[PDB]
Write a protein that binds this ligand. Sequence first.
Ligand SMILES: [Cl-]
Ligand SMILES: [Cl-]
Ligand code: NA
Ligand code: NA
Lengths: 16, 16, 16, 16, 16, 16
Amino acid sequence: ACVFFCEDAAIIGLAV
Amino acid sequence: ACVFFCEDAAIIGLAV
Amino acid sequence: ACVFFCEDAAIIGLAV
Amino acid sequence: ACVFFCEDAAIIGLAV
Amino acid sequence: ACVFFCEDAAIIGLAV
Amino acid sequence: ACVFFCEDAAIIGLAV
Ligand SMILES: [Cl-]
Ligand SMILES: [Cl-]
Ligand code: NA
Ligand code: NA
């Protein structure tokens, strides 16, 4: 999987 | 966030 | 370039 | 893998 | 949105 | 091109 940095607010890492 | 269209098969829209 | 669908709120297309 | 919609012109789905 | 790291060279963080 | 950070385990930068 890959890590993405997106704002969910707050900016966090997300594993896809 | 961003909508990604990924296959896990089923092609799923992911809320990332 | 590629089109991404992300919320900027509102969800829109974005050309990268 | 994920489907990207990109052009280089025709827009196509790229399998990544 | 998501932060993408793309090269246009200079590698730029993009607010998408 | 964009740099993705992905693992399949070592995490590496993938050039897309
Ligand atoms: Cl994993
Ligand atoms: Cl273009
Ligand atoms: Na990961
Ligand atoms: Na485009």
